[PDB]
Scaffold this active site. Structure first.
Site, PDB file in Angstrom:
ATOM      1  N   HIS A   2      -7.868   0.314   4.692  1.00 54.91           N
ATOM      2  CA  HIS A   2      -8.067   1.297   5.748  1.00 54.91           C
ATOM      3  C   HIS A   2      -8.893   0.726   6.903  1.00 54.91           C
ATOM      4  CE1 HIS A   2      -7.116   3.330   2.163  1.00 54.91           C
ATOM      5  NE2 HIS A   2      -6.848   4.411   2.908  1.00 54.91           N
ATOM      6  N   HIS A  12       1.597  14.675   0.143  1.00 53.46           N
ATOM      7  CA  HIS A  12       1.806  14.486   1.597  1.00 53.46           C
ATOM      8  C   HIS A  12       3.238  14.883   2.020  1.00 53.46           C
ATOM      9  CE1 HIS A  12      -2.015  12.474   2.640  1.00 53.46           C
ATOM     10  NE2 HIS A  12      -1.750  11.374   1.925  1.00 53.46           N
ATOM     11  N   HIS A  36       0.831  -1.194   0.000  1.00 54.34           N
ATOM     12  CA  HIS A  36       0.000   0.000   0.000  1.00 54.34           C
ATOM     13  C   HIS A  36       0.877   1.260   0.000  1.00 54.34           C
ATOM     14  CE1 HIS A  36      -4.001   1.484   0.130  1.00 54.34           C
ATOM     15  NE2 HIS A  36      -3.358   2.573   0.540  1.00 54.34           N
ATOM     16  N   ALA A  37       0.708   2.128  -1.000  1.00 53.79           N
ATOM     17  CA  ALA A  37       1.500   3.339  -1.098  1.00 53.79           C
ATOM     18  C   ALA A  37       1.296   4.238   0.132  1.00 53.79           C
ATOM     19  CB  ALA A  37       1.095   4.071  -2.362  1.00 53.79           C
ATOM     20  N   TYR A  94     -10.961  11.443   2.618  1.00 53.42           N
ATOM     21  CA  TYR A  94     -10.845  11.357   1.180  1.00 53.42           C
ATOM     22  C   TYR A  94     -12.114  11.950   0.559  1.00 53.42           C
ATOM     23  CZ  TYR A  94      -7.092   8.091   2.356  1.00 53.42           C
ATOM     24  OH  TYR A  94      -5.900   7.584   2.694  1.00 53.42           O
ATOM     25  N   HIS A 146      -0.199  12.128  -5.439  1.00 50.56           N
ATOM     26  CA  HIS A 146      -0.896  12.059  -4.177  1.00 50.56           C
ATOM     27  C   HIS A 146       0.102  11.942  -3.025  1.00 50.56           C
ATOM     28  CE1 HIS A 146      -4.220  11.209  -1.378  1.00 50.56           C
ATOM     29  NE2 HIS A 146      -3.194  10.616  -0.780  1.00 50.56           N
TER      30      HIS A 146
HETATM   31  C1  LIG Z   1      -2.899   5.270  -1.652  1.00 49.05           C
HETATM   32  C2  LIG Z   1      -3.294   6.154  -0.442  1.00 49.05           C
HETATM   33  N1  LIG Z   1      -2.511   5.617   0.660  1.00 49.05           N
HETATM   34  C3  LIG Z   1      -2.722   6.291   1.861  1.00 49.05           C
HETATM   35  C4  LIG Z   1      -2.764   7.799   1.505  1.00 49.05           C
HETATM   36  O1  LIG Z   1      -1.811   8.366   0.905  1.00 49.05           O
HETATM   37  O2  LIG Z   1      -3.770   8.520   1.850  1.00 49.05           O
HETATM   38  C5  LIG Z   1      -1.599   5.873   2.878  1.00 49.05           C
HETATM   39  C6  LIG Z   1      -2.016   4.696   3.852  1.00 49.05           C
HETATM   40  C7  LIG Z   1      -2.842   5.467   4.983  1.00 49.05           C
HETATM   41  C8  LIG Z   1      -2.542   6.838   4.863  1.00 49.05           C
HETATM   42  N2  LIG Z   1      -1.435   6.874   3.719  1.00 49.05           N
HETATM   43  C9  LIG Z   1      -0.355   7.836   3.668  1.00 49.05           C
HETATM   44  O3  LIG Z   1       0.501   7.797   2.815  1.00 49.05           O
HETATM   45  C10 LIG Z   1      -0.366   8.959   4.726  1.00 49.05           C
HETATM   46  C11 LIG Z   1       0.758   9.115   5.536  1.00 49.05           C
HETATM   47  C12 LIG Z   1       0.769  10.173   6.463  1.00 49.05           C
HETATM   48  C13 LIG Z   1      -0.376  11.010   6.602  1.00 49.05           C
HETATM   49  C14 LIG Z   1      -0.131  12.118   7.658  1.00 49.05           C
HETATM   50  O4  LIG Z   1       1.007  12.124   8.133  1.00 49.05           O
HETATM   51  O5  LIG Z   1      -0.873  13.069   7.989  1.00 49.05           O
HETATM   52  C15 LIG Z   1      -1.563  10.861   5.795  1.00 49.05           C
HETATM   53  C16 LIG Z   1      -1.521   9.824   4.838  1.00 49.05           C
HETATM   54  C17 LIG Z   1      -4.749   5.767  -0.221  1.00 49.05           C
HETATM   55  O6  LIG Z   1      -5.059   4.866   0.501  1.00 49.05           O
HETATM   56  N3  LIG Z   1      -5.728   6.454  -0.970  1.00 49.05           N
HETATM   57  C18 LIG Z   1      -5.221   7.597  -1.919  1.00 49.05           C
HETATM   58  C19 LIG Z   1      -6.417   8.132  -2.475  1.00 49.05           C
HETATM   59  C20 LIG Z   1      -7.601   7.133  -2.243  1.00 49.05           C
HETATM   60  C21 LIG Z   1      -7.108   6.247  -1.024  1.00 49.05           C
HETATM   61  C22 LIG Z   1      -7.503   4.805  -1.415  1.00 49.05           C
HETATM   62  O7  LIG Z   1      -6.877   4.131  -2.258  1.00 49.05           O
HETATM   63  O8  LIG Z   1      -8.459   4.131  -0.987  1.00 49.05           O
HETATM   64 ZN   LIG Z   2      -3.145  10.316   1.149  1.00 55.26          ZN
END
Ligand SMILES: C[C@H](N[C@H](C(=O)O)[C@@H]1CCCN1C(=O)c1ccc(C(=O)O)cc1)C(=O)N1CCC[C@H]1C(=O)O
Ligand SMILES: [Zn+2]
Ligand SMILES: *[C@@H]1O[C@H](CO[C@@H]2O[C@@H](C)[C@@H](O)[C@@H](O)[C@@H]2O)[C@@H](O[C@@H]2O[C@H](CO)[C@@H](O[C@@H]3O[C@H](CO)[C@@H](O)[C@H](O)[C@@H]3O)[C@H](O)[C@H]2NC(C)=O)[C@H](O)[C@H]1NC(C)=O
Ligand SMILES: [Cl-]
Ligand SMILES: [Cl-]
Length: 575
Positions: A471, A347, A313-314, A481, A343
């Site tokens: 999530h 961050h 997971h990115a 989101y 995206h």
């Molecule tokens: C792939 C995108 N990945 C997430 C994300 O980037 O949101 C990853 C996993 C959870 C959050 N995340 C961060 O990398 C992230 C890291 C730090 C912070 C913070 O410090 O405040 C916030 C986020 C995503 O799930 N997404 C992206 C868009 C849709 C959603 C999904 O795929 O269901």
């Molecule tokens: Zn994000």
């Protein structure tokens, strides 16, 4: 007096940085190397963090925040009094830490196996099946198989997780964990605000759903598609039906217009993940924003490593010393991952902009803001013009436009109900209106009522489809989101006006606007220091969240969908 408060915040700040820096390290080392060892060292650094939270959080609780004069220090102290999980007694803390670890791991190591054939992982195998297969039965195999192996396997830990995350919220003074989450926006009218926002998007969403339904009926046949009923959830090109752009080619408005699969073209021109992130960095710096440091290229993991290991997971990573930032993504070379790179890069950009605030104040103006930065730039990247200039398209007309808006709509509009329904479900699980006897059925009510989808296979007790979405096991809030998808249009609309753009909002490309960079940078520098309407106001000239920029971006497509759906007699909706 006020000077003991000053000294406390100073001390929490210096010691935070160290303990957070050590835990970010171990958390990385494990996400890029699932072992029992890295597993340990991390469950370890988890304790150290928890004990640092308990001690500073106990001290913060001893100050009467009422009596504080300094607004910044008031706010820091108030936040530190929330211990989160560290509020749990030692036993439950340990149990809770174990549960989350076990949920993440379970989700990340799940495989769907053909009998006497080989075994598919989520990224990239099942993703690719969902994206490109056009055989009802093959899609069903992947859709059901994933819910069977990831979904069901999470069911055993969820009620226990629920009780623990609730217990911790109660001991921090909230009513349950959903109440705790909602409070990160400091906006008492939030539920109604989002509801209002959601209702404004219905005409576009219903129109797109009906139009796509008709296209699937044509490809998969009348006996598989009820033209007045929900769409089967496995036919939209994505594991969760959360974006639909992989089925673009089933639904092209104007197939007689020339078109290039971007993905097709990136591959031809020998693009790598490195190039994708280099392009994203270039976009950021074109606006006058910060580059990532050299360390970022040394240290990031921008492809699935080869040597039989990882959490795919990115995600973006702040290491809390204002010099080390990183991304961990198993990048596929496609358009979809190019957007994802942007995206994650947004961050990273926020981390760098707010690196000098006190740690307690290192967050987005609201979580929605953190999610929207990368997306805003990527709306520019996605324009035909910008893609032409990347040598990824051939690139005019009213026809080309509608096609383009339809590609965009399959990503943005379709996700609106998805992104809305997740936390609606979780909020109800947290407050106890949904129980484990009810998890899945109530997940399906929401999928049906918001998204107009049906499961391709009847669900049975024992299914837990929510645990099949990242999530949910990882306990990451999702409403962010939804806020993102609305506010990214508003931001895009504002940055276009700053940049001097005229005519239709969807033609805007803000590449190299220094005016646009400036709006973003000053917004992001605030961190979590001010109520979010203040950042909204800096970027956009007003303080509210509003659908009208999204509606106005898609307005030509909505005119087109209405005319098309009406010709065909579509009955919008489902029963
Ligand atoms: C792939 C995108 N990945 C997430 C994300 O980037 O949101 C990853 C996993 C959870 C959050 N995340 C961060 O990398 C992230 C890291 C730090 C912070 C913070 O410090 O405040 C916030 C986020 C995503 O799930 N997404 C992206 C868009 C849709 C959603 C999904 O795929 O269901
Ligand atoms: Zn994000
Ligand atoms: C209420 O207190 C805040 C925060 O105070 C800061 O943190 C405390 C714990 C103490 O240790 C203070 O020493 C410390 O100042 C005050 O905010 C801070 O105000 C200063 C201006 O005095 C801002 O400083 C700027 O810093 C940049 C580089 O960092 C310079 O280029 C500028 O010229 C300027 O010096 C500082 O950034 C700001 N801190 C934060 C985190 O907001 C605040 O002013 C005070 N309110 C009042 C007016 O009493
Ligand atoms: Cl599902
Ligand atoms: Cl959130």
């Amino acid at each position: 007096d006020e000077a003991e408060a000053s000294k406390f915040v100073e001390e929490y700040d210096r010691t935070s940085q160290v303990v957070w820096n050590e835990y970010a390290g171990a958390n990385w080392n494990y996400n890029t190397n699932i072992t029992t060892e890295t597993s340990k060292i991390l469950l370890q650094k988890n304790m150290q963090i928890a004990q640092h939270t308990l001690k500073y959080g106990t001290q913060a609780r001893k100050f009467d925040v009422n009596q504080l004069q300094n607004t910044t220090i008031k706010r820091i102290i108030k936040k530190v009094q929330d211990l989160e999980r560290a509020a749990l007694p030692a036993q439950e803390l340990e149990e809770y830490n174990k549960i989350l670890l076990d949920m993440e791991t379970t989700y990340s190591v799940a495989t769907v196996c053909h009998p006497q054939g080989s075994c598919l992982q989520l990224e990239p195998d099942l993703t690719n099946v969902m994206a490109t297969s056009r055989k009802y039965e093959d899609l069903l195999w992947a859709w059901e198989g994933w819910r069977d192996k990831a979904g069901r396997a999470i069911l055993q830990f969820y009620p226990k997780y629920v009780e623990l995350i609730n217990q911790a919220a109660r001991l921090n003074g909230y009513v349950d964990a959903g109440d705790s989450w909602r409070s990160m926006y400091e906006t008492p009218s939030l539920e109604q605000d989002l509801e209002r926002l959601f209702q404004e998007l219905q005409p576009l969403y219903l129109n797109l759903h009906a139009y796509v339904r008709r296209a699937l009926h044509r490809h998969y046949g009348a006996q598989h598609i009820n033209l007045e009923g929900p769409i089967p959830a496995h036919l939209l090109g994505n594991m969760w039906a959360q974006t639909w752009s992989n089925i673009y080619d089933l639904v092209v408005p104007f197939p007689s217009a020339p078109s290039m699969d971007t993905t097709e073209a990136m591959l031809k021109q020998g693009w790598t993940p490195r190039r994708m992130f280099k392009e994203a960095d270039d976009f950021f710096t074109s606006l006058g924003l910060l580059p990532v440091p050299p360390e970022f290229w040394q240290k990031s993991m921008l492809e699935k490593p080869t040597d039989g290991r990882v959490v795919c997971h990115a995600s973006a990573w702040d290491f809390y010393n204002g010099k080390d930032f990183r991304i961990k993504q198993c990048t596929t070379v496609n358009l979809e991952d190019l957007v994802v790179a942007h995206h994650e890069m947004g961050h990273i950009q926020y981390f760098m902009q707010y690196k000098d605030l006190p740690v307690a104040l290192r967050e987005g103006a609201n979580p929605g803001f953190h999610e929207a930065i990368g997306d805003v730039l990527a709306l520019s990247v996605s324009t035909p013009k910008h893609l032409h200039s990347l040598n990824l398209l051939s690139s005019g007309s009213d026809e080309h436009d509608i096609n383009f808006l339809m590609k965009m709509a399959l990503d943005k509009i379709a996700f609106i109900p998805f992104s809305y329904l997740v936390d609606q479900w979780r909020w109800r699980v947290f407050d106890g209106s949904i129980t484990k006897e009810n998890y899945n059925q109530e997940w399906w009510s929401l999928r049906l009522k918001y998204q107009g989808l049906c499961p391709p296979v009847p669900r049975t007790q024992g299914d837990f489809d929510p645990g099949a979405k990242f999530h949910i096991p990882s306990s990451v809030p999702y409403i962010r989101y939804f806020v993102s998808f609305i506010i990214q249009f508003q931001f895009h609309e504002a940055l276009c006006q700053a940049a001097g753009h005229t005519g239709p909002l969807h033609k805007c490309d803000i590449y190299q606007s220094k005016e646009a960079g400036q709006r973003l940078a000053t917004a992001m520098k605030l961190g979590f220091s001010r109520p979010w309407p203040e950042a909204m106001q800096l970027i956009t000239g007003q303080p509210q969240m509003s659908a009208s920029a999204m509606l106005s971006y898609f307005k030509p497509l909505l005119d087109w969908l209405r005319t098309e759906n009406e010709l065909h007699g579509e009955k919008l909706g489902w029963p």
